[PDB]
Amino acid sequence: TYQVVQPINGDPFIGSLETPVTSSPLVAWYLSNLPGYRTAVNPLLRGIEVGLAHGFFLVGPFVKAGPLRNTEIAGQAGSLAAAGLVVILSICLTIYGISSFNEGDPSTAPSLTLTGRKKQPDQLQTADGWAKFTGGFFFGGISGVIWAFFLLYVLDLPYY
Amino acid sequence: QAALYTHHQYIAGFIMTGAFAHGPIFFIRDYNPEQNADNVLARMLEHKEAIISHLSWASLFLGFHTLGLYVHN
Amino acid sequence: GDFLVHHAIALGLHTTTLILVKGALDARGSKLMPDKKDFGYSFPCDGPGRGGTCDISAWDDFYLAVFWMLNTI
Amino acid sequence: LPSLFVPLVGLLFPAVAMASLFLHVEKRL
Amino acid sequence: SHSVKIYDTCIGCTQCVRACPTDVLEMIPWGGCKAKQIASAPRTEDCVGCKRCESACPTDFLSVRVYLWHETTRSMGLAY
Amino acid sequence: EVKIILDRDPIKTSFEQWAKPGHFSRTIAKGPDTTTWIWNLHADAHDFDSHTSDLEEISRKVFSAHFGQLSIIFLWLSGMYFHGARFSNYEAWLNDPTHIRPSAQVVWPIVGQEILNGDVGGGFRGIQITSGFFQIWRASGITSELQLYCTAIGALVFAGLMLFAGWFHYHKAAPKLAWFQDVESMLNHHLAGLLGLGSLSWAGHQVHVSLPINQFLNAGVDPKEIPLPHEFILNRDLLAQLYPSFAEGATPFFTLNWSKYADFLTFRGGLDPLTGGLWLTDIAHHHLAIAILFLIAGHMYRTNWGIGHGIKDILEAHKGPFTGQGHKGLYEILTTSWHAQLSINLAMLGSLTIVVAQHMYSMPPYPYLATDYATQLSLFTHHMWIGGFLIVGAAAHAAIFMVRDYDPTTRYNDLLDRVLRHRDAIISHLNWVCIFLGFHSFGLYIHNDTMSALGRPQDMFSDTAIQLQPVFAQWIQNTHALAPGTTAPGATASTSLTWGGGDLVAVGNKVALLPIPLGTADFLVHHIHAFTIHVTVLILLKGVLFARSSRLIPDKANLGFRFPCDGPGRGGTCQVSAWDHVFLGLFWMYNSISVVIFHFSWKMQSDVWGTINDQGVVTHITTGNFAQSSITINGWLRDFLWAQASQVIQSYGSSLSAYGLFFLGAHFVWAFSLMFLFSGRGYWQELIESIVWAHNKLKVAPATQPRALSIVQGRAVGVTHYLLGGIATTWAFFLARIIAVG
Amino acid sequence: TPPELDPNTPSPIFGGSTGGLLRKAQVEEFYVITWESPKEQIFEMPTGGAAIMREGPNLLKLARKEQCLALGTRLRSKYKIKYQFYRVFPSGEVQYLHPKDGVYPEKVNPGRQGVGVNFRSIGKNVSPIEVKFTGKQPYDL
Amino acid sequence: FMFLISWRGYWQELIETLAWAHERTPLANLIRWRDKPVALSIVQARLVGLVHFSVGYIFTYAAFLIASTSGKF
Ligand code: CLA
Ligand code: CLA
Ligand code: CLA
Ligand code: CLA
Ligand code: CLA
C-alpha cells in the first residue's frame, strides 16, 4: 500500500515522476545548495564558485593525458590548455546569454515555488545577470586552473 | 594523367545530371503548354511513354547480357 | 575485355538517362499523381494513399540518378 | 615563420565566424 | 500552416472528416451532388499533413487535397 | 479443477480449399485485381490470429504447424545420415581423422562441376563439409555406413509419423483450448518428460555404446574389428574388461554407497590429449546429473493432486513497494496470448544458441572437433547468426502483443503499466548509453588510426603505449585457473584450456586449444560488442514501448503493427511503426554479429590455432598480429580482410571455386538490396506506367494489373537481400579461408 | 449556440506518466478535454498507460489537441460518451474547439459556411508559370 | 547509408524523448534551446545521405587512384 513512486508534486498529467533520486531529502538538500540554485544570491557570485570548481578540475585530464607529458617534460603546461578551454567556454556562455536574454527583458525563471508560494521573483536569466554569471565564471575558471597548477609546482600528489 | 582524367569525368558526370535537373524544373516552373502547342517540345510529353519504355528496353537488354557474359566467364 | 566494359558503360549511360528523362517527362504529372505540378520540383511525397508515393517527385529521381551516374563514371 | 597564419584560419576565423553566425541566426528583430 | 482545398468533384461521402486526426474538415450544405453536402477546411491551422483525408477519398481524383506549406508548431506535431 | 485430455471429432479434410488461393483471409479469397494480391497471400499465410479471432482455432493451427516443422527436421536429418552412408568417406575418415578431410556430397559430372569434387583424402572426391556430423557419429560409436543408413530410415519413418500427427490433431482429434492452457502440466512434462528422460536416455547410450566403442577407437584398433554395440550389452564381459565397475549389477547404486562407478564417470574436466574433445567419461556423467535435476524440477507445478505450485499464486505474491501490485494478471496474459509466449521463447532460445556457440569452441565436446578449424569456425558462426536472428524476432512479437493483445481494461498487469508510464525515461537513457559506448569504443579506434598515421605509436591505445588492460576479465580468467583442487577439489583439471595457464593440447600437428590471452586489443572489441548490442536493444525496445502511442502519433495502435507510416505530416512520419523498428534493428543485429564473428576468426587464427611440432615451437596461422593490428581500423582492413581474402579470390580452378563464385555472388545481391533501400515505390509505379503502355500497344497487357511493391515490402525485400548478401559473403570468405589454410 | 465553459471539475485517477505536459504548455498552449462518464471506468491514456475514468464530469489536460481527439474519438466509440475539448493558452483565455458547431463535423449542419473550396474542381488549376511572380499559388485561386 | 536506409519518423520519436530528458535534468534545464529540436525532413534526409555517399565515393577512389599510381609511378 505504500509505493515510493509518485506523480510529480501530486500532478499526474505533468511530465515528470517522483523517485528517490529526484525528491529525496538528501538529493533536495544537495541540489538546493549548489551555487546554481541559490536563486537569491548574486549571479556573479554564484558563477565564480562554478568556475573555480570546474577550472581546478580540468587541469588533471589535460596534463595527464596530454601529448606534451606522457613521459614528456612539458608537464603541467597542459593546465595551460585547460586555461584555454575555460576561455572557449566563457565565450559560449557569453554567446548563450547574449542571444537568449535581451536587455530590457525580465527574468524567465519560474516565480512560483513548488508549493505554490507565489512569493518569489527570481534569478539572473536576464541579460544583466547572465553576463555577471559568465563574467564570474571566467574569473573563477582561470583562478581554478592557476591554483591547481600552483599545486602542481609544489607537487606531492600521488598521480602527478 | 590519371588524376586529371578521373577529375573531369566526375565533373562531367555531375554536370550531366544537373542538365537533366533544370530540364524538369523548366517543365514545372516555366513551361507554357498553350504557347508550345503541338511543337517539338510538346510532342515529347505527348509520346513520353514511348520514350521511357524504350530506354527501359535498352537498359534491360544491355544489363541482361553484359552481366550475363561476365558471369558466364 | 574492352568489349565488355564498353557495354557496361553503355548500360550506365542508358539507365542514368532513363531515370533522368523519366523524371523530366513525369515532372508535371502521371497516373499516380496527375497534378505533380502545383507541388513543385521538390516535395517529400504524396502520402501512403493510392498505394504509396515515396520518391515520386522529379527531385527524387535526380536523387536516384546520381547513384547511377556515380556507378557509371 | 609565416606558417602561423594557420591557426588564424584554422581556429580564430572559424570561432569568430561561428559566433557571429550564431548570433545572426538567433536574432529576433 | 498547411493548405487544404476541396473541389466540386466531392460527393459528400464524408470519409475524410472521419479520417482526420486533428479536426480540420467538416461538412456543409450544398446542392452539387445527391448527398447535398461538401467538405470544408475551416481550420487548416490545426492540420498536421498526414493526408489521412486523401487516403480516404473515393473520387477518381482526390476531391480534397493537402498542399504542405509553412511549418508551424501545430503542423510539426510537437508536444514540446 | 482437474486436468484431462480434451479433444473434438473431425473438422474437415479436402482439396477443395487447395484450389482456392487465399482462402484463409476474407479480403484475399476473392482473387487478384492487382499484383499486390500475390505478395499479400504469402505475407499473411502464417498470420493465424489475423485469420480468425477464436483462440481455440489459432491454437490448433500452431500445434499442427509444429508437427509440420518437426516432420521437416526429421526429413532433413534423414538426408544427412543417408549422405553419410552413400556419398561419404566416413569409414575412411574413421581410421585417419587427423589428415583426411570430411566430405559428404558428391557432384554429378555435368557442365564442369566435377572440379568441386576435390581431394578430400581417403581416395575420395567431393565437397568438404563443416556441419560437424562426422565427429558426432564417431562420438555415438557409429562404425559402419549400415548404421547411418538405418538411422536414415528411422528418421524418415519418424518424419512420416510427425506429419501424420499434424493432420490427426487438426483434422481428426483437435485439442481443446483448455488443454493448451494447462501450463502447469506442460512445464512439468517438458521439464521432466522431454528434458529429464531425454538426457537420461542419452546418458544410457553413452555408457553402453559411446564410451565402450570410443575406447577401442582410441586404443587404435581397426573400426571394422570393433565389436558391435549390442555385443557390449549381451556379454557384459566385454564391458567388464574395460570399465570393470560393471562387474556388479545395480549395486552399488541400489545399495547406495556411491561409488565404484568413478571408473566410467568422473569430474576430471579439461580435454582429452588424444582426441581433443571433452572426456566422454565426464559427458556421460554430466547427462546423469541433468536427467535427475530435470526429473526433480518436473514436480514443481500443481495439477490433479493438490501438491505443487499454482503459477498464478506464485506471481501474484511477488509485489514490492517500487512495483505496485505487479506480476498480478501476468498468468492470464501469458495463457491467453501466443505472441507473448513466442517473444519470451525467441529471446531465450536465441540467447541460448549464442551461449552454445561460445561453449562449444572453448569446450570442444566431440572427438577430433577442436583441430578441425573448418568446422569450429562454421559452428560458432552458424549459432551466432541463428541466435542473433531469433532475438530480433522476440522484439517483433513483443511489439505485436502490444498492438494486438494488450488490453488494460481486461487483462491489466501494473508491471507492464508504469513501464509505459515512463517509456521516455528508459529510451532517453538507453540513447545516452549508446552514444557513450560509441565514443568510448569506436572513438578509441579512430584515435588509434590518426595517431598511427601521424607516426605517433606511443600516443595510441595499445599494450605498448596507453594500456587499457581488461583486468576484470583477466582476474576471473586466473580464478578459473586456480579453481581445481582449491575451490573445486573434485575437479582434476581446469574447466577449459583457455583458463589452463600452462597447459596445451595438440592432435596431429595442429593446436586444439590453449590459454587465450587478453589485452588492450580485447578490451576495445568487447566495448564494441557492448556498444553494438545496446544500439540493437535501443531500436527494438523503442519499437515495443512506443508501439501503441507517441507524442507524435497518439493513436499509433489503430494503424496496426505493420504499416508504412502516417504520411509526410508532422515533418514526416516514415518508419514510426513497430515493424519498421524490427526492420531497422535487423541491420544493427547484422552489424553486431558481423564484428563478433570477425572477432572470433582473427583471435583464433592469431592466438590459438596453428601448427605445432615436437620441439614445443608454436606457429599460429596469422602469427599473433591481433594484439598490435586489430587496434586499428586500417589494421582490420589490411591484416584481416585484405590478407585473408586472398584464398577466396584465388580459388578459381581449385575445388574451392564455388566459394569464389558465392563471394562475388553475395556482393551482388547485397548491392542489389540498396536499390530497394534507397528508393520509393512512387518512382517505380510511374516507370511501370510507361511499360504498361507498351504492352497495351501490342495487346499483351495482363488483367492482373502490375503494381510496384508496397512501401513495407520494399523495406522487407531490401533488408532481406542486405542480410543474404552480407552474410553469404562472409560465409564464402570464411569457408574458403579456413579450408585452404586450416 | 454557445459552447460549454467549465472549469472546476475533477480529473481522472492516474499515477503519473512521462508523456505529460512540458514547457510548451507553460509558454505556448495546452489543451483540455472534458467529458461525462456514467460509471467509474478504466481507459487507455494517449500519453501514458492506464487511467480510471471518474463517474460524472471529468477533466483532462493534454498537450497538442490531437491527443485530445484521439482520446475523445476513443471515448465516442468503445463506450458511448459525449466529449468536448478546448485550447487553453497561457494567459487564461480559453478557446472552444470541438465540436464547435453544435453537432459533430461528420454531420452536415446548416450554420456552417465553407472555407477553401474551389468550384472549378478537377485538376483544372493553372500551370505554375501562370502565377509566376504573383504571390498567389494555383490552388489558392 | 544511415540517412538513406532509416527514415524520419523513427528519429522524430527519438528526439522528443530527448526533449523530455533535457527539461527533466537538474542543472541542465537552466539552459534552454532557442530552436526546437526536430528530425531532419524527408527530402533533407535524401540530400544529406546522397552528399555523404558522394563525398565518400569521390574521396575513396581518389585515395586509391593517387596512392596506387604514385606509389609505383
Ligand atoms: C586548423 C585547425 C587546428 C589547429 C591549428 C589545431 C592545433 C592543435 N591541436 Mg587540434 N583539432 C582540430 C583542429 C586544429 N587543431 C580538429 C578539427 C579536431 C577534431 C578532430 C581537433 C582535435 C584535437 C585533439 C584531441 C587535440 C588537439 C591538440 C592540438 C594541439 C597539438 C599540438 C601540441 O601539442 O602543442 C601544445 C600543447 C598544448 C596543450 C598547448 C596549449 C595551447 C594554448 C593553451 C592555447 C591557448 C588557448 C586558446 C588561446 C583559446 C582559443 C581562442 C580562440 C578560439 C579564439 C595544437 C595546438 C592536442 C592538444 O591541444 O593537447 C591537449 C589534442 O589533445 N586537437
Ligand atoms: C494430406 C491431405 C490434406 C488435405 C486434403 C488438407 C486440406 C486442408 N487443410 Mg490440412 N494438413 C495436413 C493434410 C491435408 N490438409 C497435414 C499432414 C497437416 C500437418 C502439418 C495439416 C495441417 C493443417 C493446418 C494447420 C491447416 C490445414 C488447413 C487445410 C484446409 C486449407 C487448404 C489449404 O490451402 O492448405 C495449403 C496447401 C498447401 C500446398 C500448403 C503446403 C504447406 C507445406 C507443409 C509446405 C512444406 C514446406 C516446404 C517444403 C518449405 C520449402 C520451401 C522451399 C523449397 C522454397 C484444407 C481443407 C487449414 C484450414 O483449416 O483453413 C483455415 C489450416 O489451418 N491443414
Ligand atoms: C548491384 C546492385 C544493383 C543492380 C543489379 C541493379 C539493377 C537494375 N537497376 Mg538499380 N539501383 C541501385 C543498384 C542496382 N541496380 C542503387 C543502389 C540505386 C539507387 C537507389 C539504384 C536505382 C535505380 C533506378 C532509378 C533504376 C534502376 C534500374 C535498374 C534496372 C536497369 C536495367 C537493367 O539492367 O536490366 C537487367 C536486369 C538486371 C541486371 C538485374 C537482374 C538480376 C538477375 C540477372 C535476373 C535473373 C535472376 C536469376 C534467374 C536468379 C533468380 C534467383 C531466384 C531466387 C529466383 C536493373 C534491374 C532502372 C530500371 O528499372 O530499368 C528499366 C531504373 O530506372 N536502379
Ligand atoms: C519461432 C519462430 C517464429 C515464428 C513461429 C514466427 C511467426 C510469425 N511471424 Mg515472426 N520473426 C521471427 C521468428 C518467428 N516468427 C524472427 C527470428 C524474426 C526476425 C527477422 C521475425 C520477424 C517478423 C516480422 C517483421 C513479422 C513477423 C510476422 C510473423 C507472423 C506471420 C509471418 C508469415 O506469414 O510468414 C511468411 C513467410 C514468408 C513471406 C517467407 C519469406 C522468405 C524470407 C523473408 C527469406 C527466406 C530466404 C532463405 C532464408 C534463404 C534464401 C533462399 C532463396 C534463394 C530461395 C507469424 C505469426 C509478421 C507479422 O505481422 O506477425 C503477425 C511480421 O510482419 N516476424
Ligand atoms: C558507418 C556509418 C554509421 C555511423 C558512423 C553510425 C552512427 C550512429 N548510429 Mg547509425 N545506422 C547506419 C550507419 C551508421 N551509424 C545505417 C546504414 C543504418 C540503417 C539501418 C543505421 C541505423 C541506426 C539507428 C536506428 C540508430 C543508429 C544510431 C547511431 C548512433 C549510435 C550512438 C553513438 O555511437 O554515438 C557516437 C557517434 C559515433 C561513434 C560516430 C563517430 C564519432 C567520431 C569518431 C568522433 C567525432 C569526430 C570529431 C571529434 C567531430 C568534430 C569534427 C568537426 C570538424 C565537425 C551513432 C551516431 C542510434 C542512435 O541514434 O544513438 C543513440 C540509433 O537508434 N543508427
One DSSP character per residue, F578-616 reads: HHHHHHHHHHHHHHHHHHHHHHHHHHHHHHT-EEE-TTS
| Contact: G18, H32; criterion CB under 8 Å | no
> Interface of chain F against chain E, CB under 8 Å?
551-552, 554-555, 566-571, 573
> What whole-number distance in Å separates Cα of residue H36 and Cα of residue E80?
8
β partners of residue F103: F128
Q: Which residue of E has its CA nearest to H36?
A: E80
**Experimental technique:** X-ray
Q: Do F711 and C54 touch (CB under 8 A)?
A: yes
Q: How many domains does chain A have?
A: 1
CB F722 within 8 A of CB F676: no
CA–CA dist G138, H11 (Å, integer): 34
Q: Is F76 annotated as a binding residue?
A: no
Q: What length is written for chain D?
A: 29
User: Ligand 1 within 6 A of A66 CB?
Assistant: yes
C-alpha cell at F9: 471429432
**What is the C-alpha separation between F427 and F538, in angstroms, rounded?**
7
CB F543 within 8 A of CB F646: no
Instruction: Kindly list the structural domains of chain F, giving each domain's residue range(s) and its CATH number in brackets, ordered by start.
Output: 1-742 (1.20.1130.10)
Q: Which residue has the cell 559566433?
A: D19
Q: Name, in order, each residue with C-beta under 8 angstroms of G34's C-beta and a sequence gap of 6 or more.
A: G4, G6, G7, G9, G57, G58, G59, G60, G83, G84, G85, G86
Residue with cell 569568430: D16
Residue G14 to residue F549: CA distance in whole angstroms: 17
Nearest to H54 by CA among F738, C69, A115: C69
Place of cell 557384459: F236
Helix (H) or strand (E) holding H70: helix H42-72
F431 CA closest ligand 5 atom index: 62
Structural domain that includes position E70: 1-80
Dihedral (CA of F354, F356, F362, F368) sign? negative
Question: CA F322 to CA G137: how far, in whole Å?
Answer: 59
Query: What are the cell numbers at E59?
Result: 473520387
List alpha helices for F363-422, DSSP H: 373-404, 416-419
Chain G residues lying within 8 Å of C39, measured CB to CB: none
Touch of F by G (3+ CB pairs closer than 8 Å): yes
Bridge partners (DSSP) listed for residue E65: E5
Beta strands in D1-29 (DSSP E): none
Q: How many domains does chain E have?
A: 1
What are the residues whose beta carbons fall under 8 Å from the beta carbon of E56, sequence distance 6 or more? C49, E15, E16, E18, E19
Contacting residues of F for B53, CB less than 8 Å apart: 690-691, 693-694
Cα separation of E62 and C34, whole Å?
10
F535 pocket-lining for ligand 5 (C-beta < 6 Å): yes
In which element (H, E) is residue H13 found? helix H8-23
Cα F636 from Cα F173, distance rounded (Å)? 59
The answer to whether G24 contacts E65, with C-beta atoms less than 8 Å apart, is no
CA B26 vs CA A81, B41, C19, C64: distances in Å: 56, 12, 17, 19
Contact H13/F678, CB-based, under 8 Å? no
Residue G13 to residue G41: CA distance in whole angstroms: 10
d(CA A76, CA A69): 8
Q: Nominal resolution in Å?
A: 2.8
Domain with residue E71: its CATH number is 3.30.70.20
- Please list, in sequence order, all residues whose beta carbon lies within 8 angstroms of the beta carbon of residue C53, skipping any fewer than 6 positions away: C32, C33, C45, C46, C47, F680, F681, F682, F685
Q: Give Cβ neighbours of residue E42 (< 8 Å, ≥ 6 apart).
A: E26, G112, G113, G114, G115, G116
Interchain proximity F708–C51, CB inside 8 Å? yes
Q: Whose CA is nearest to atom 44 of ligand 3?
A: B64
Check C44 against H41: CB less than 8 A apart: yes
- Mutation target to probe the A interface, by most A beta carbons within 10 A, among D11, D12, D25, D26 is D26
Separation in Å, CA of B46 to nearest CA in chain F: 12
Per residue in F673-691, is it b (16+ CB within 10 Å) or e — as a string? bbbbbbbbbbbbbbbbbbb
CA of A27 to the centre of ligand 5 (A): 34
Residue E65 in 3-state DSSP? strand
Give me the helix-helix angle, C2-25 and C58-72, nearest 10°: 170
**β pairing state of F7-8 and F118-119:** unpaired
Q: With beta carbons less than 8 A apart as the criterion, state whether F565 and F553 touch.
A: no
Give the separation between CA F273 and CA F511, rounded to whole angstroms: 11
Establish whether F39 is an annotated binding residue: no
d(CA H10, ligand 5 centre) in Å: 15
Q: Is residue G127 reached through a cis peptide bond, with omega within 30 degrees of 0 on the bond before it? A: no
CATH node for G1-141: 3.30.1470.10
CA distance F487 to F654: 53
Count of A-G CB contacts under 8 Å: 37
Domain containing residue A122: 1-160
Q: What is the CATH number of the domain that holds A102?
A: 1.20.1240.10
For residue F46 the three cell numbers come to 502464417
